[PDB]
Amino acid sequence: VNIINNSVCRGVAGRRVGDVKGVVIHNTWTNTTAEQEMNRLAGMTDKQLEAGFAHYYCDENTIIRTEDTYNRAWHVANSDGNNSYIGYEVRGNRETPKAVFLQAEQNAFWQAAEDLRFYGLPVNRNTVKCHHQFSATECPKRSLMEHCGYDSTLAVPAAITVQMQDYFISQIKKYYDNPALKPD
Ligand SMILES: [Cl-]
Ligand SMILES: [Cl-]
Ligand SMILES: [Cl-]
Ligand SMILES: [Cl-]
Ligand code: NA
Ligand code: NA
Ligand code: NA
Ligand SMILES: [Zn+2]
């Protein structure tokens, strides 16, 4: 997997105050490459970045760190979420091929495990969260369809949220506990 560190989000949200609390696994609900996502952010004004961005963008081949993890990111429309949780964007919409989406997901899980291990956090329901636990959204919609069978515009039910967390936790913990394991 190609690793690219390029902080195109320019630190506009400022440094995190306080400890890291966990990670949020997003889906872009687009079918663009991680590099296309990076270029899109690089071409925005700092005002346009106010619409939102994450710390990493991942596709089947690439992990791009678009914001240093010591900075906040405007990724969940919630102040404590934006301050305390690191955001991972997985390439994935309805058109993305299954195997491409699943590889992209694994790349994000591997990077999330690296960061949880670095900050010394456990891998559990406190530290692995979904965007819709912070604010109203269907995200992570493709993960929800693939792993929970939930393809809907209704607000994600609590039992499905827990199931999606547990899936994310199982994948992240596999990398967390096995530091030499690679996502490909
Ligand atoms: Cl999103
Ligand atoms: Cl904002
Ligand atoms: Cl397919
Ligand atoms: Cl909510
Ligand atoms: Na997006
Ligand atoms: Na934006
Ligand atoms: Na985004
Ligand atoms: Zn999201």
Author numbering: 2 to 185
Question: Which of the paper's sentences describe this entry?
Answer:
In the present study, a putative cell-wall lytic enzyme (EfAmi1) with predictive amidase activity was identified in the prophage sequence integrated into the Enterococcus faecium 11C6_DIV0699 genome and characterized. EfAmi1 is composed by two domains: a N-terminal Zn2+-dependent N-acetylmuramoyl-l-alanine amidase-2 (NALAA-2) domain and a C-terminal domain with unknown structure and function. The amidase-2 family includes Zn2+-dependent NALAAs that cleave the amide bond between N-acetylmuramic acid and L-Ala in bacterial cell walls. EfAmi1 exhibits broad-spectrum activity against both Gram-positive and Gram-negative bacteria.
The results revealed that only the catalytic amidase-2 domain (aa 2–185) was crystallized and its 3D structure was determined at 1.97 Å resolution. The absence of the C-terminal domain from the resolved structure was due to protein degradation, as discussed in another section. Analysis of the resolved structure revealed the presence of a β-sheet bundle structure, comprising of five β-strands: β1 (amino acids 3–6), β2 (amino acids 23–28), β3 (amino acids 57–60), β4 (amino acids 63–66), β5 (amino acids 86–91). The bundle is framed by four large α-helices (α1, α4, α6, α7) and 3 smaller ones (α2, α3, α5). This secondary structure forms a characteristic cavity in the middle of the structure. The presence of a zinc ion (Zn2+) was observed inside the cavity, although no Zn2+ was added to the crystallization buffer. The zinc ion in EfAmi1 structure is coordinated by two histidines (His27, His132) and a cysteine residue (Cys140), which are highly conserved. The tetrahedral coordination sphere of zinc is completed by a chloride ion. The architecture and size of the zinc-binding cavity indicates that it most likely serves as the binding site for the peptidoglycan. However, Thr330 in LysGH15 contributes to catalytic activity as revealed by the finding that the Thr330Ala mutant demonstrates a 50% decreased activity. Therefore, Glu90 and Thr138 are predicted to be key residues in EfAmi1.
